[PDB]
RNA sequence: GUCGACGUACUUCAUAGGAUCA
RNA sequence: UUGUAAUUGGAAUGAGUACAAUGUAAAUACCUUAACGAGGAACAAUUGGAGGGCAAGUCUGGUGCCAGCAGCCG
């Protein structure tokens, strides 16, 4: 029974799946740096002094990891992050406990889909006794399974030699990240989304002297791309964490900077037919038709009106007729209705098969029905593909997932190229038509349950929605039994309330969380996390309505 | 009188019906008119034949004040006394009396309706439905058979009736074969009617009766008077010729020592053949 | 004139939802 | 079940052919309804003796 | 705000056709409700 | 800002894609050298009818009248009713409306009024079983057109309600490899405020092409008169070969003006279907724009769709670059393996539209 | 183990009735179609279209109650003690 | 009733 | 095909009677 | 002479921390034990069930002012 699930499509690719995002979040000095630099000497037998940015690194025959070293103060990297890590290694100081980023990113993971989560303990030779140790274990791995799941693999970490790690459980980690599997998640399978792995500004600097150096940017982005399909085709919408939403002005295929042992083995043994480390930031009719400059009388004839008229063209009456004097030609389409006697069960058994075949054209469980039908359906998709010739293939389905690509963005603020900092991640996030809409988003909203104070009607609240983050005033409601949309003055202490806000419009069912504060400055000491919800419909208008009493004596 | 309540099983009734929007009903035995007024909304127009007259009325006060005024027409009187207008799907729970009867008119009328729902008693509706080899075959089942098949809908049950009726009933559609074979009726219904006196004997046996000598000799009498040949017309004058002449077909066309119950329509032609071929006509 | 249409209004608002809370209890028993 | 019935479908065919091949009409023909009277009125005696008279 | 009381209906002239429609329906066949003598 | 587009070619095809798609678009020189140029009353009624079923959306047209800017909102249907002007039937306003009805918000309740039959536009028949057979393949279990009063030109006076009851996330993938098995052919001959006799002679005249054929030939006679008929003399007829394999249907239609002769427009018709069948290979031409549209806009996946090279002609190549302008989806053609005949493979990849106006 | 494809009593203007306490969900080991209760309106909004909800032997002929939704207790839920992951 | 529920609208200036 | 038989599993209808009192 | 204390007094003690020693192959733990370790003794026991009461609040029905549903929303 427990082996029954949803059914859901996998868009991971085939063949040359991209690298996998492994995000090392947790709070400030509590060792992620020495953790990523311990694990990558493992790999590949060569420590990094320094580490900026994503770095990919090879991990065993057909596998691949980028490491990601989450700022630690910024709750909006926190946001984004949670959104496109594939895997997190949460690390946690063992003498000092749970903390705020923790506990505030956890949260934000299990709204936005939760990715595979990893503990971490460290610091624990601080510890001075061996029972209070034991003990400390015992509660934070409890209060961890709280959070993640019941029996969730929690490592542990004595000290630090040599900015390393003892090799022994960094041995136990690397194996444990190698066998792991990945679940399905919507959103991550619905949109396209890339890591930015370098950065580059392409503007003529001839235009930053006579223009000066307000003028808009022209940008390339390299990476990996991850989830969907990216449009080969450029006009593509997408929207860049913290900068905004552009349109890709140029996209091409670049060489796989980092390629795979078993990825070169096979161009190599291409070659008889006829670098674990990459951190650079630290008259064929089908061609006919789509030619434009040709018309298309000029395309029919070469190879050989309107849809207003829904008709289609025919030859006169008589021509018709003539051409139709008899029934030969088309006997083929209709049903037919000693040695002749094969003859005959010949020509029945084929129209019993017409006739009644498909009635009669198994599984053991529904589950595994719904799967096949992906799953036939997944082949059918693969199968043309090979078929299909590499320059068509392109234009048809785009860049695959796991293509290392050059994107190009015009008109990219001056400021992002200017105040870059190569900590902070850089994500690029495909866009829906419906993404693009702005309008009234309904939403079944309730106060966070850890946070100490209820929200008021008209009062600023970020929300992280899909992969924008974004300020607006909510106005929370009630259903009066279904009769009415009346405003309330604040949220429920301990129950959901609908809530209506503009901004951008999203496909029902897509989760969120709020957060009144985002600044350093002000995160005091209370969790950050305001409010969580699930967006219920969308529209252009609203019909909120207050109570109001007219009093006479 | 006996009158359905259970509305479900009319609701089945008039969706199985499958009437398109373009067709014209014959909806027997009216009633109150539960059926009539779904079938109103979803056809082109309805003729109702009604026998009590007050019930005609209850009807047409009933249906008074709607949308579907024109598209209702009541003929009031008995329904094979009058002779009808074209109609494309019957839809009846007629009393049972005249279960037997109504089937055939539709079978003999000039353009027969493509579908049929008709209600009919449980043993009268297997009987319908029999098939070759069954314990309840018989003539009906033989010749409705030949002019059309027939398929069960429903069982409906004593309960949905008030008063209760003694016996249960059903629900089956018939369809009228179109083309209609091309074999004469009354030849037909003579063979069986010969054939099916008990169906669990020999056909032979079936033929040894002196009746049935008398009648094949002097239809034989009349055919050969029809092809100018004379014909002395003594009583017993061919008893020894027909005789033989049924032996013979008997014998060849191997049917002698099959039961009739367990024949079915290719071996009944067959027989039908071979008596016309050596000059016996039944009917 | 404003007072008829209400009262039309919340009378067919009243039998659509009968007619639904018919539909449903007949579906789930 | 289905090449069973289209055989027969196609034996009911040519034997229905062949039927139409030799056809008469029955209205002079007495039919089998009288298989249990046994004996008859002297009314059917003469309407009988009246048909044979018009057929000759 | 609510009403207590059911609005006076006013006489347009498609209530007056319907109503009038039913007087006509109801003379055609002489379905008249009327009292009889005992 | 805006895609642009030249002339009223397409305007219906172009509109729809543009609601679909939710890009904005331009048209622009609508019959600028004619007389009496721009926008046509019936096309007028048609951004009418669009604004109608949908919020949000913003339709501009030029004070000359030979440019529109069209900005789309999100669909939402309703109940509502629609006055068509005599210069149009009802099948040229509701054919766009099957592209949109499944997608909605709410269910579509729209009430047609005016002319039911042309020359040049879908009929009644063509649309019930003509296109909507192609949506209930594709996932629209539940559609009808419910024809309450038939009106011929020139007075017209019919009244048609189209309810679309099945509101789907998005059409299913369509895999149709081979040319399917037409096992029947029925129809409906059909009449207003004119003599049954003239039904009959149609029905005689369709049957003596058709009698030749292999299968059924059965044709209804539906005759309309009365109130109902509608105001003006008229007669026409549809022939639908079924494939009851697939569901797959292959119709044509017309209708008769007055004095044609009833016989020579049943052989006409009846020897049109037959025409149909014949440059088909799994969709008929009248029914392919449906399919291509419906294929673009399905999950991100490729559906499969078998066409004959007959298929291939003006229509559709403009048809395949309106659909890359809006969608920038590729059609991909590939030759079959047999021999016997010439059909290819339409394979098209899917945007992973989805419907979001539908509340959940 | 179930897929809770509607919310029944979601419409219902009583509130805390027994009809707005059930849904409509499918049986993922044979596709047949169910219908269980939840304990609370309250709980009923965690409760949406297209999770996972783990069932359990219980407005007549409803003879199911739902205990987990998405792998979390629904209990843990109503309590706030866990959040539902998605 | 009309105008209730409605943002858009065509813009028509001939 | 809202087919028949059987097998299996469930639902349902048949509960009040004597004594005293008003 | 019954019930209630974020009232109040000085006595006791281990959960935990920890010199030491015992323990053990070496450790951890137990038993010991210097020295710390209690008033919300916040050093903050749980899992189920039953029953209330409240409003310028909300829904539904009607032999007026009522009844049902219910009530984190006044
Ligand atoms: N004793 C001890 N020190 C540790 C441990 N893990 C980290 N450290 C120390 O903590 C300091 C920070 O280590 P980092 O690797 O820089 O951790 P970080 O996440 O990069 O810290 P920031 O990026 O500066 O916020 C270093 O001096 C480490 O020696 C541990 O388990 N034990
Ligand atoms: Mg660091
Ligand atoms: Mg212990």
Redesign the pocket.
């Given at each position: 029974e427990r082996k029954l699930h949803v059914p859901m499509v996998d868009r991971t690719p085939e063949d040359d799946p991209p690298p996998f995002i492994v995000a090392v979040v947790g709070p400030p000095g509590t060792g992620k740096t020495t953790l990523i630099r311990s694990l990558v000497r493992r790999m590949t037998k060569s420590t990094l002094n320094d580490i900026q940015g994503p770095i990919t690194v090879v991990s065993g025959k057909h596998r691949r990891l980028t490491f990601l070293e989450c700022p630690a103060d910024d709750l909006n990297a926190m946001i984004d992050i949670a959104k496109i890590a594939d895997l997190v290694l949460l690390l946690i100081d063992g003498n000092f406990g749970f903390e705020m980023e923790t506990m505030e990113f956890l949260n934000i993971a299990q709204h936005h889909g939760m990715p595979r989560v990893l503990g971490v303990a460290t610091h624990l030779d601080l510890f001075?006794?061996?029972?209070?140790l034991?003990?400390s274990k015992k509660r934070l791995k409890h209060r961890f399974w709280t959070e993640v799941y019941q029996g969730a693999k929690l490592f542990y970490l004595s000290g630090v030699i040599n900015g390393r790690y003892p090799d022994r459980e960094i041995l136990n980690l690397s194996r444990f990240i190698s066998v792991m599997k990945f679940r399905p998640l919507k959103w991550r399978n619905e949109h396209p989304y890339m890591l930015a792995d370098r950065f580059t500004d392409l503007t003529h600097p001839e235009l930053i002297e006579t223009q000066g150096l307000q003028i808009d940017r022209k940008v390339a982005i390299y990476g990996y791309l991850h989830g969907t399909p990216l449009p080969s085709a450029p006009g593509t919408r997408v929207h860049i964490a913290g900068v905004g939403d552009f349109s890709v002005a140029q996209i091409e295929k670049l060489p796989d900077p980092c390629p795979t042992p078993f990825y070169q083995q096979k161009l190599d043994d291409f070659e008889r037919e006829k670098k674990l480390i990459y951190a650079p930031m630290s008259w064929n009719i089908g061609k006919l038709i789509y030619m434009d400059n040709i018309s298309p009388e000029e395309c029919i004839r070469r190879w050989r009106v309107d849809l207003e008229k829904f008709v289609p063209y025919f030859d006169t009456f008589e021509k018709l007729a003539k051409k139709w004097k008899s029934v030969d030609a088309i006997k083929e389409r209709f049903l037919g209705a000693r040695e002749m006697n094969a003859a005959k069960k010949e020509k029945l058994r084929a129209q019993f098969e017409i006739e009644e075949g498909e009635?009669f054209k198994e599984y053991d469980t529904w589950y595994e029905l719904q799967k096949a039908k992906i799953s036939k359906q997944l082949e059918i998709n693969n199968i043309e593909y090979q078929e299909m010739t590499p320059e068509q293939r392109q234009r048809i389905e785009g860049f695959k997932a796991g293509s290392y690509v050059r994107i190009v963005f015009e008109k990219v603020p001056m400021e992002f190229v200017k105040n870059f900092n190569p900590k902070f991640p850089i994500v690029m996030g495909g866009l829906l038509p419906t993404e693009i809409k702005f309008g009234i988003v309904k939403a079944r909203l309730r106060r966070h349950r850890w946070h100490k104070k209820i929200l008021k009607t008209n009062d600023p609240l970020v929300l992280s929605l899909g992969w924008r983050r974004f300020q607006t005033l909510p106005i929370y409601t009630?259903t009066?039994?279904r009769?009415r949309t009346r405003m309330?003055?604040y949220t429920?202490?301990?129950?959901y309330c609908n809530a209506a806000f503009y901004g951008p419009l999203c496909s029902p069912n897509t989760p969120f969380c709020g957060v009144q504060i985002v600044a350093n400055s002000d995160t005091g000491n209370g969790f950050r996390i305001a409010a969580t919800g699930i967006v219920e419909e969308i529209d252009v208008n609203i019909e909120i309505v207050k109570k109001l009493?007219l009093?006479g004596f | 009188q006996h009158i359905l309540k259970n509305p479900?099983v009319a609701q089945?009734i008039v969706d199985?019906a499958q009437i398109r929007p373009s067709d014209v009903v014959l909806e027997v035995g009216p009633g109150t008119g539960n059926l009539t007024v779904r079938i109103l909304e979803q056809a082109k127009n309805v003729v109702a034949v009604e026998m009590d007259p007050r019930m005609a009325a209850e009807l047409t006060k009933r249906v008074r004040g709607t949308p579907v005024e024109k598209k209702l027409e009541i003929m009031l009187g008995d329904f094979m006394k009058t002779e009808l207008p074209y109609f494309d799907i019957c839809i009846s729970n007629t009393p049972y009396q005249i279960s037997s009867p109504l089937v055939f008119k539709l079978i003999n009328q000039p353009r027969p309706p493509r579908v049929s729902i008709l209600m009919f008693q449980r043993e009268f509706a297997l009987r319908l439905l029999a098939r070759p080899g069954d314990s309840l075959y018989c003539r009906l089942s033989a010749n409705v058979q030949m002019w059309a098949n027939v398929?069960?809908?429903?069982?409906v049950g004593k309960n949905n009736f008030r008063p209760p009726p003694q016996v249960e009933s059903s629900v089956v559609?018939l369809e009228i074969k179109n083309p209609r074979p091309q074999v004469d009726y009354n030849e037909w219904d003579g063979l069986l009617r010969i054939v099916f006196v008990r169906k669990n004997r020999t056909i032979s046996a079936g033929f040894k009766s002196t009746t049935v000598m008398d009648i094949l000799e002097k239809n034989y009498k009349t055919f050969l008077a029809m092809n100018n040949e004379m014909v002395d017309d003594t009583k017993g004058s061919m008893h020894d010729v027909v005789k033989e002449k049924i032996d013979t077909v008997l014998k060849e066309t191997d049917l002698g020592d099959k039961r009739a119950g367990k024949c079915d329509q290719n071996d009944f032609l067959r027989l039908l053949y071979a008596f016309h071929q050596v000059g016996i006509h039944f009917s | 004139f404003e007072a008829r249409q209400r009262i039309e209004e919340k009378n067919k608002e009243?039998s659509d939802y009968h007619a639904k809370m018919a539909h449903i209890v007949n579906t789930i028993n | 079940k289905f090449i069973e019935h289209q055989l027969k479908r196609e034996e009911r065919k040519t034997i229905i052919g062949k039927l139409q091949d030799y056809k008469i009409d029955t209205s002079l023909l007495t039919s089998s309804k009288r298989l249990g009277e046994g004996r008859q009125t002297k009314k059917e005696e003469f309407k009988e003796a009246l048909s044979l008279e018009r057929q000759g | 705000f609510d009403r207590t009381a059911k609005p006076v209906p006013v006489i347009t002239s498609e209530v007056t056709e319907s109503l009038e429609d039913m007087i006509r329906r109801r003379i055609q066949d002489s379905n008249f409700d009327d009292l009889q003598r005992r | 800002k805006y895609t642009t587009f030249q002339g009223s070619q397409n305007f219906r095809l172009r509109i729809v894609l543009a609601t679909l798609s939710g890009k904005p678009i331009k048209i622009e020189k609508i019959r600028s050298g004619d007389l009496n140029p721009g926008l046509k009353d019936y096309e007028v009624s048609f951004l009418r009818l669009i604004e109608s079923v949908t919020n949000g959306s913003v339709i501009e047209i030029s004070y000359t009248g030979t440019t529109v800017i069209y900005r789309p909102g999100i669909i939402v249907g309703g109940a509502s009713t629609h006055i068509c002007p005599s210069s149009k039937p009802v099948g040229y306003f509701v054919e766009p409306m099957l592209y949109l009805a499944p997608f909605s918000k709410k269910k579509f309740s729209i009430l047609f009024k005016g002319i039911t039959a042309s020359h040049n536009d879908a009929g009644i028949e063509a649309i019930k079983w003509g296109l909507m057979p192609v949506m209930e393949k594709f996932g629209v279990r539940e559609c009808a057109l419910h024809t309450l009063k038939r009106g011929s030109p020139p007075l017209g006076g019919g009244e048609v309600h189209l309810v679309v009851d099945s509101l789907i996330a998005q059409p299913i993938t369509m895999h149709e490899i081979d040319r399917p098995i037409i096992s029947s052919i029925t129809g409906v001959a059909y009449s207003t405020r004119v003599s049954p006799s003239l039904v009959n002679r149609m029905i005689d005249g369709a049957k003596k092409v058709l009698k030749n054929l292999q299968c059924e030939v059965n044709i209804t006679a539906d005759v309309w008169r009365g109130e109902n008929s509608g105001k003006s003399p008229g007669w026409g007829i549809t022939l639908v070969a079924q494939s009851k394999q697939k569901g797959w249907s292959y119709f044509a239609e017309d209708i008769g003006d007055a004095g044609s002769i009833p016989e020579e427009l049943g052989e006409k018709v009846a020897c049109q279907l037959l025409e149909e069948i014949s440059k088909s290979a799994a969709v008929g031409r009248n029914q392919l724009p449906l399919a291509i549209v419906y294929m673009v806009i399905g999950k991100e996946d490729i559906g499969r769709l078998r066409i004959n090279k007959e298929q291939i002609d003006e229509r559709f190549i403009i048809l395949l670059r309106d659909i890359k302008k809006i969608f920038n989806t590729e059609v991909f053609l590939k030759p079959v393996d047999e021999a016997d005949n010439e059909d290819m493979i339409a394979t098209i990849k899917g945007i992973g539209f989805t419907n979001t106006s539908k509340k959940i | 183990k179930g897929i809770v494809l509607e919310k029944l009593g979601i419409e219902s203007?009583?509130?805390?009735?027994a009809i707005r306490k059930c849904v409509r969900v499918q049986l993922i080991k044979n596709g047949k179609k169910v219908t269980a209760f939840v304990p609370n309106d309250?709980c009923l909004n965690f409760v949406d279209e297209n999770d996972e909800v783990l069932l359990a032997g219980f407005i007549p002929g409803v003879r199911f109650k739902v205990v987990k939704v998405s792998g979390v207790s629904l209990?843990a839920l109503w309590k706030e003690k866990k959040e539902k992951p998605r | 009733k009309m105008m209730k529920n409605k943002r858009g609208g065509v813009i028509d200036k001939r």
């Open positions: 001075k006794s061996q029972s209070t034991r003990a009635n009630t009066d039994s009769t309330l003055k429920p202490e301990h129950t009493k009093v | 479900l089945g199985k398929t069960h809908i429903m069982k559609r | 009243s | - | - | - | 203007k009583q509130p805390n009735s309250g209990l | -």
